Amino acid sequence: GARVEDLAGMDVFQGCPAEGLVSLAASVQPLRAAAGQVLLRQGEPAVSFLLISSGSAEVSHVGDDGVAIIARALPGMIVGEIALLRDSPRSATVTTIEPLTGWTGGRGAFATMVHIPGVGERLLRTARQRLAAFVSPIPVRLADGTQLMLRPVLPGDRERTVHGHIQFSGETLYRRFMSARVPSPALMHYLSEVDYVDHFVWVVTDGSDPVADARFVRDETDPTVAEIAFTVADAYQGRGIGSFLIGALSVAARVDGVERFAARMLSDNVPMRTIMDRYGAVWQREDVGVITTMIDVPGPGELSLGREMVDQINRVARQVIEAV
Ligand SMILES: CC(=O)SCCNC(=O)CCNC(=O)[C@H](O)C(C)(C)COP(=O)(O)OP(=O)(O)OC[C@H]1O[C@@H](n2cnc3c(N)ncnc32)[C@H](O)[C@@H]1OP(=O)(O)O
Ligand SMILES: Nc1ncnc2c1ncn2[C@@H]1O[C@@H]2COP(=O)(O)O[C@H]2[C@H]1O
């Protein structure tokens, strides 16, 4: 098999004490593939997973719309884990780009891997982030006629925004973060790389570039409550996006077992206060210049969204949340 050292470098194994990797390392087998070799095919039954040492691969998923969604598998990453988590067929076709080496294992070695402390949770989180990219974005039409799309957040949204053309002003950032400075890389990682269970995020785009986001973060002590936050790009404000997003967030919260939303905001934020007032918010003074509220996540019919839109949002939330 491999050396414990050889596994120690894989993403999913970071921080894992050597001892826990012993049998796994002994049980995996070496793999070498040439360039342009198909490793896995979408829809096929599953046996093995692969830990990539070197080289890389294209990942290609054909969705219901018939469009192939493309991604990359890189050195340090596992591939073929999702089918083994779900007992499903392969979610994607995986083809080597350049020559690739690594280690493979079967369902037996996979069982060892998932019981390695901390690892099962990492596998699930990464699987969710991956499957999130295969969700069909939901068309949303604003009152003013603007056509946008609604989808779960993706780790890649950090890069898209930072290098994008959509502007978030100093004022917008202060209203959102209590600082006008551009959000640090560390913060942007935190905002875009999430588990969807405890921390859930919707992104609205123009069909390419993100223009807004909404998130809830489940409270540690009381799982039935979550803290919420919203951001909308300046040019996109005042068009109904925020009002839409609180509804979408409420749909996802229902799937996630979240009964109540908590919020804090500057006392001067009129648009946000108004959005929450619709849902029955009563305001407490928290710090100086900050106010807070708790509201019940609105149930059936008291959302202005309409059934078709509600069902689409519910279907997508479940796809990311419940996939594995
Ligand atoms: C809990 C936290 O998230 S606090 C921090 C929130 N984030 C920020 O403040 C950052 C900068 N601003 C924004 O991101 C956005 O403006 C948000 C999230 C505050 C609001 O979203 P928007 O898309 O602009 O709001 P939207 O157009 O849906 O209208 C909001 C509501 O207030 C009203 N409104 C719209 N513009 C304004 C305005 N300039 N001033 C006061 N009220 C307004 C609308 O009537 C609407 O009411 P409705 O729910 O009955 O339809
Ligand atoms: N968005 C993605 N990014 C990177 N790898 C992915 C992505 N989606 C799927 N995969 C990998 O492609 C594999 C195809 O088979 P599985 O569904 O077993 O497990 C899948 C993941 O390992």
Swiss-Prot record:
Annotated residues for binding of 3',5'-cyclic AMP: G80, E81, I82, A83, R90, S91, R130
Enzyme Commission code: 2.3.1.-
Domain N-acetyltransferase per the UniProt entry, residue ranges: 148-310
Keyword Transferase found: yes
MF annotations from Gene Ontology: acetyltransferase activity; acyltransferase activity; cAMP binding; DNA-binding transcription factor activity; metal ion binding
Cofactor(s) for this UniProt protein: Mg(2+)
Top-rank taxon: Bacteria
Notes on activation and inhibition: Autoinhibited and allosterically activated by 3,5-cyclic adenosine monophosphate (cAMP). An extensive conformational rearrangement relieves this autoinhibition by means of a substrate-mimicking lid that covers the protein-substrate binding surface.
Matching SUPFAM superfamilies: Acyl-CoA N-acyltransferases (Nat), cAMP-binding domain-like
Quaternary context: Homodimer.
Function: Catalyzes specifically the acetylation of the epsilon-amino group of a highly conserved lysine residue in acetyl-CoA synthetase (ACS). This acetylation results in the inactivation of ACS activity and could be important for mycobacteria to adjust to environmental changes.
Protein known as: Acetyltransferase Pat
